[PDB]
Amino acid sequence: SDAVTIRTRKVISNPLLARKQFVVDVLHPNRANVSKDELREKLAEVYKAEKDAVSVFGFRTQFGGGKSVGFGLVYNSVAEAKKFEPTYRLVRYGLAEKVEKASRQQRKQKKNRDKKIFGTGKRLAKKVARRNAD
Amino acid sequence: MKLNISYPVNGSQKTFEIDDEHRIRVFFDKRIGQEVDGEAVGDEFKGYVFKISGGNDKQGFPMKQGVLLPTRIKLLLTKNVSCYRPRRDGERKRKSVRGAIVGPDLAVLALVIVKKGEQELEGLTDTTVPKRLGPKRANNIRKFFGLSKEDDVRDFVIRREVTKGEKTYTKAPKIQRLVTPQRLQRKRHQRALKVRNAQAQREAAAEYAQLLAKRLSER
């Protein structure tokens, strides 16, 4: 197979975050833009943990090709992986997926309309319907 | 003309549109906190004494209980007044309020029964509205039930059966100021902390004065 050599430099172990931070230096001659998923799988294999506590991100491909450098995360366990990863990284990886919320402008106008109504909706809706219906 | 007649004892209220202003004029030039004879309001109101408390005029303006005018005025309202809910701490606003003297300009008058006479009236005395919320604080519920201090109010408290999910799980109020072993522990802890601080500081003062005497002995 292709000699996709994933060197890992600058390994700092911070059990403070129960984690290992490092720089990944994937050497990939004759092939471009190595896939983040296969980075995750290879790093999980090298660091003897599941491919749910390993993360890779921020990959700039070297000018000319043959090399890419990014950052890598290795949690001791999937639980703290899920606690410490940002939700966007989790969704990219395949864990709990994105929340289907409305647009920020809608949300803002929504809370702005809430800002007018004082109590709960029922005590005013009864009066409104009653009055409008006579 | 509308009238919000309310019967507070056992709880009730409802509205009467009265017309034929001839059978309205008795409610004119009447202040707030004043009693009226129901007879003039009607023969079906024989023996009703009504205490007038506020109301709304035409164009919706609430009326102020101490202005003593038959015309509406602009008044700078404050935190602890009627007709204004401050939207920010310390805010004072100028709103138009209706005067205390009731006249034809009033759309709806608000009146409460303070005496029952002749045959009862529909929807105020036949109906009875139970109080929405029973007592919650220990000594309020004690005074409501006419009990003494050492009566262990936990045994029976107002309990509402919300038969929602085929369990009929009952909810009772949480108790405030209840004599609790935890509260007693907190009180004992606070007293213990005060005494321990006092003793430790007195010991520190004694030993520092000892040091002062020792170092002044060198002369």
Partner: protein, 258 residues
């Protein structure tokens, strides 16, 4: 202007934090606390930029809110907590202790210390004053007030605080020949010995300091900090020992690694 400011714009932050210019518009505003605004180090910078432990502010806040970080013996879970000079930062995971001291160039260098010496922390006597009810007290440089002190402790002295009882165990008296550490100015981070103290009543007291290589520099009394007796520091000195080599000598030392 109209109230205390709550933001600290980047490029207004203290220089020794070595903050990246082009990361954002703002620098971490030190919260109110023991030492000062200008001469303190926020835990955000100390945890993310000096140690590289955290990648961002969310991870710094997570580190602080899991009670890992512990400053001066207490957890200090504030994300911009003002950890200052000589403060002991104890991390239980990666069990290791830091003393936040100036480097030779004046920055807080990352300086590991041992637990047996990290038990205590040192403080400059900011004032000695007789409090209410006739109880004397000492205020140190780090905002610590200690009751019932030894009557011989005067201003500009230094005291070792146990940091578990917060009480004086031993202290150094400000006199000529005492190992002192420079806590301000151009000479910030330098270590030397007092040779002379010019008084200048009404004005600012001056002190002349002769370092281990006999270089003599004068600094105001306000930013000179005693750390003990010559050659015998009561704290763990940093790797550079505060020498302030000239640039040529520094360049030669760098070139020696070849």
């Amino acid at each position: 202007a109209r109230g205390p400011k709550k933001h600290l714009k980047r490029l207004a932050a203290p220089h020794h934090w070595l903050l990246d210019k082009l990361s954002g518009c703002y620098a971490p505003r030190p919260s109110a606390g023991p030492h000062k605004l200008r001469e303190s180090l926020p835990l955000i910078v100390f945890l993310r930029n000096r140690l590289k432990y955290a990648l961002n502010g969310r991870e710094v806040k997570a580190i602080l809110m899991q009670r890992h970080v512990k400053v001066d013996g207490k957890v200090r879970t504030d994300t911009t907590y003002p950890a200052g000079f000589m403060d002991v930062i104890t991390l239980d995971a990666t069990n290791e202790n830091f003393r936040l001291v100036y480097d030779v160039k004046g920055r807080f260098a990352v300086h590991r210390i041992t637990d047996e010496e990290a038990s205590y922390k040192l403080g400059k006597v900011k004032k000695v004053q007789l409090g209410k009810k006739g109880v004397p007290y000492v205020v140190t440089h780090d905002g610590r007030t200690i009751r019932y002190p030894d009557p011989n402790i005067k201003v500009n002295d230094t005291v070792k605080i146990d940091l578990a009882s917060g009480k004086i165990t031993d202290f150094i008296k400000f006199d000529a020949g005492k190992l002192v550490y420079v806590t301000g100015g151009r000479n910030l981070g330098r270590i030397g010995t007092i040779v002379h103290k010019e008084r200048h009543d009404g004005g600012f007291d001056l002190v002349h300091i002769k370092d281990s290589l006999d270089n003599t520099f004068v600094t105001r009394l306000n930013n000179v900090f005693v750390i003990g007796e010559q050659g015998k520091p009561y704290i763990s000195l940093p790797k550079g020992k505060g020498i302030k080599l000239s640039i040529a000598e520094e360049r030669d030392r760098r070139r020696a690694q070849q």
